[PDB]
């Protein structure tokens, strides 16, 4: 089945804020929402379907006709109710070894977001954002994401 | 779908969702993947590229999916769609009473707009890239199709 409806409203909130910002500041990259395929490797095949994918201006060439080919700048994952610890670990490990520079884990069930940022070859310790916090990334310098706008009441 | 398809979907979602955020009490918009259940026996479940639910119809939105005909359904033509698939979605939305149905063609940068009158859709209104797309379901919202179809 598709994700639940609140999962999709959280996703569209996030996409709305990031896409609005990119549109008013042309030349800052593009954002895509699921379903958008990201090919991190062809053999053994690792194709993922993140909820949101951001590609910086200097990486636009990753955007192929059919899918995104390589590690995007920011991947966003929204936890569903049927996610097991091993699924969280094996996505975190895949994005780390592919060198995805920033990874957001959004948890609808606790209204929190964990941010991981790559430093060298490994992710730094997660920074945690609660619903009352404002989320920002150096990848999107001039963007403030109030998480009260992301997590519906 | 291909990346230009998703860019088009995102462009439409950006415009509609921004409008609804700035005009609270006007409904909610969902993007794929969002399940819409138009029939339970026999089961007929679609994943439209975009789904709009008016404020009065927000009870259609359950925990898992949307049960019933939303006010607006947006389908973006993909290259792999078969004739029976396009025919049967049109027929399914028409008999379910979906009030407005947009078919977005990325290959011609056009949108075809069907609105329900009685039991049947009227003749379609065709919008080109140089036009403003709008719907009485969203009074006050201009969707310039030059911001929807990338150059
Ligand atoms: Cl479908
Ligand atoms: Mg989507």
From TrEMBL, chain A:
Transmembrane segments: none annotated. This is Putative restriction endonuclease domain-containing protein. It comes from the Bacteria. Residues 1-147 form the Putative restriction endonuclease domain.
């Amino acid at each position: 089945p598709a994700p639940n409806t609140r999962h999709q409203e959280i996703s569209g909130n996030l996409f709305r804020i990031i896409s609005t910002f990119l549109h008013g500041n042309p030349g800052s990259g593009k954002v895509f929402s699921a379903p958008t395929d990201v090919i991190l490797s062809h053999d053994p095949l690792r194709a993922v379907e993140p909820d949101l994918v951001f590609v910086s201006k200097d990486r636009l060439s990753l955007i192929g006709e059919k899918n995104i080919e390589g590690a995007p700048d920011l991947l966003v994952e929204i936890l569903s109710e049927g996610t097991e610890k091993r699924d969280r670990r094996e996505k975190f490990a895949l994005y780390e070894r592919s060198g995805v520079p920033e990874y957001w884990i959004v948890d609808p069930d606790t209204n929190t977001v964990q941010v991981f940022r790559l430093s060298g070859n490994t992710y730094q310790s997660p920074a945690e954002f609660r619903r009352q916090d404002v989320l920002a990334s150096p990848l999107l310098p001039g963007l403030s994401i109030p998480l009260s706008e992301v997590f519906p009441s």
